[PDB]
Amino acid sequence: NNDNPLFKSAMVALSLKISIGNVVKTMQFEPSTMVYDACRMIRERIPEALAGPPNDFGLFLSDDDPKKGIWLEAGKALDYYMLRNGDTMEYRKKQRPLKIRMLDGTVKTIMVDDSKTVTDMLMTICARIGITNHDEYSLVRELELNWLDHGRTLREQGVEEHETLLLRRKFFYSDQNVDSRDPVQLNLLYVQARDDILNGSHPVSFDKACEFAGFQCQIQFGPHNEQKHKAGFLDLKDFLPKEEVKQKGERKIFQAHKNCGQMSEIEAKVRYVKLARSLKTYGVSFFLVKEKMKGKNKLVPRLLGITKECVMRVDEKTKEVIQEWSLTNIKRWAASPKSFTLDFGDYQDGYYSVQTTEGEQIAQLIAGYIDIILKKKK
Known part of the structure; x- marks a missing residue:
């Protein structure tokens, strides 16, 4: 037709x-x-x-x-x-608004090229807010699950266009200085140290946690008062790391609280920060991994710590440092979605190979800290 x-x-x-x-x-x-x-x-x-x-x-x-x-x-x-x-x-x-939580806690919308990687979007963000050293920062989600691979795109990692991300300064030992003369800065260091301890990203023993909580009581309540601060008073979830919330801690906390005497709020904050920085675990990024021990078939959970100068094995119960390796003495490393492995060349016999779903995180931290040492050489 x-x-x-x-x-x-x-x-x-x-x-x-x-x-x-x-x-x-x-x-x-x-x-x-x-x-x-x-x-x-x-x-x-x-x-x-x-x-x-x-x-x-x-x-x-x-x-x-x-x-x-x-x-x-x-x-x-x-x-x-x-x-x-x-x-x-x-x-x-091609450009789209990306909502970023700024260092002052407010949310700022920033146009970014939507076809690029997280590193490229971080660089656009830092350009807009005057940050030249973007390598001192990273983007994270605010839902562990929050880590983002900056060599990949938001999209392929499941971050959709509605989600706000956090601009986060990486940890620096040089970013810290305990002076009672600047009360505003002392309080920021206190809240940072306290929150890391309470949320367990700074792992501490149960004995230490009750000492910290004793300073926390001085700061929040003033000097200890045996009429008011009696058994049952404390909401222990606000004073002890998640895994360590136990009634038997209250008596130890109150003893540390009592030992503060008439210490002022300022002085208790100074002491809290000093105690935290005195621990070998301070400032270290920790990952719970599973180790294979010779002579046991069930794997052993262990805390693996990464710092600017070393890698460290820490007992999961006592938080004692079991073993340290200098980054200089690592020959190579490898990560898969289920494991992470260290080769120490002739510094020891056998590799250190552990099960973890955060191996890529660990490897990038080590690679990052190693580049810094290299860039400080030439």
Whole structure:
């Protein structure tokens, strides 16, 4: 009855659904068309494609799993991306707002290039707020699960466009100085040290935790009063690390509280910070790993600590430092999604190989600290 002059064989042309907001139009493309030229063709056919300067827009191949969506490169041909008839591409603004929690706790929205890695977005953030040394910072989620691989994209790590991230200064021993003369700065150091102890990222023995809590009582309640500060008074979850919340700790806390005497709030904060910094565990990033002991088939949980100068094994119950290796004496390291391994060359016999789901975190920390020592050499 009638033939169609528009028809091209399914094999010689690509038929793609182009989406812009709620608008969707099916368009036909020669498969060798460069992404840059396909955008021009879209601008000629979809009026909502003209909603801004032409080079502000690009092509995004979406997926039902958002972690698999990808931006197309402007110099590539469409058929490089293995597209087939019926696939859906988004004509999409290349920059997008990223909400970042600033160092003063407020949230600032920052336009970033949505096709880039977390490192690239961190650099854009630091540029906007005047931070030249972006290597002193990183982005983390605020839901462990919060770590982000800065060599990968937010998207492939499950971070969608709605989520606010935290700009976080890395730990520096040089960022600290205990002076009762600056009360505001003393309080920030106190709250940082206290929160690390209470949330267990600074692992301490049960005896030490009750000592810290004794200073905490002086700070929060003033000198000990045996009428008010009696058995049952304390909400022990606010004074002891999660894993160490035990009724038998209260009597020890009150003794440490009593031993403060009439110590002032300022002086108790100084002493809290000093006690924390006096521990070998202070400032160390710890990972709970599982070790294989000779002569036991059940693996042994152990705390593995990474610092700027060494790697350290710490007993999980007593928090005693069992063993230390200097970063200088590590020959190589390896990480998989389930394990982490250290090779010490001829410094010892056998590798140190542990089960953990945070091996990549550990490896990047070691690699980071090793580069710093190198950059300080040349």
